[PDB]
């Protein structure tokens, strides 16, 4: 239904540039609350789908964007089983586990603390995508060294530094 998406695109593409910018995409997105969708999350979604390095998405790339956001709303709902419109510690544990991450209980606390911009120990839709993208990024860094894929790496000092230089 590219026809629907094209109408969506046009509405979102406010300045009619033919490309959706970060500030245009943000206005179009809801995190379920009355705060603007996390601008860092917005910029990561643009980066993930922009193929032309233009700080924006054209129509074709927006179709990827729409599918990605929609796939995340569905996951966010699947795991928000108590219909708060926020994901909780227990719900996060079910989510990440469902995703195939094996992580200690106290680590889930570090994740909440790092990503919950609301401050109630519950994760909003925009912050949930964000934390999942960081995990994804960090894991890609890791699995470049986890050769026999057993979740242990042995790295030299210089390998470590370049790992971190490509995060921060």
């Amino acid at each position: 239904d590219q026809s629907f998406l094209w109408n969506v695109f046009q509405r979102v593409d406010k300045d009619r540039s033919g490309v959706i910018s970060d500030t245009e995409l943000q206005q179009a997105l809801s995190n379920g609350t009355w705060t603007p969708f996390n601008p860092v999350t917005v910029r990561s979604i643009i980066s993930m789908f922009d193929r032309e390095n233009k700080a924006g998405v054209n129509f074709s790339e927006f179709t990827g964007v729409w599918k990605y956001i929609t796939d995340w709303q569905n996951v966010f709902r699947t795991y928000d089983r108590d219909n708060s419109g926020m994901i909780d510690k227990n719900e996060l544990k079910q989510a990440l586990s469902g995703f195939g991450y094996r992580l200690s209980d106290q680590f889930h606390d570090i994740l909440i603390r790092k990503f919950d911009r609301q401050g109630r120990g519950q994760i909003a839709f925009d912050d949930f995508i964000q934390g999942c993208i960081v995990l994804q990024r960090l894991t890609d860094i890791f699995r470049r060294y986890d050769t026999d894929q057993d979740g242990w790496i042995q790295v030299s000092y210089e390998q470590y530094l370049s790992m971190v230089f490509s995060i921060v």
């Binding site: 993930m48 990827g64 995340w72 094996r102 994804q136 894991t139 699995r143 986890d146 057993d150």
Partner: peptide, 15 residues
Amino acid sequence: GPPYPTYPGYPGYSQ
């Protein structure tokens, strides 16, 4: 296997 997904367990693992 690893303590992390190695196949498309969340959106968009291949993106």
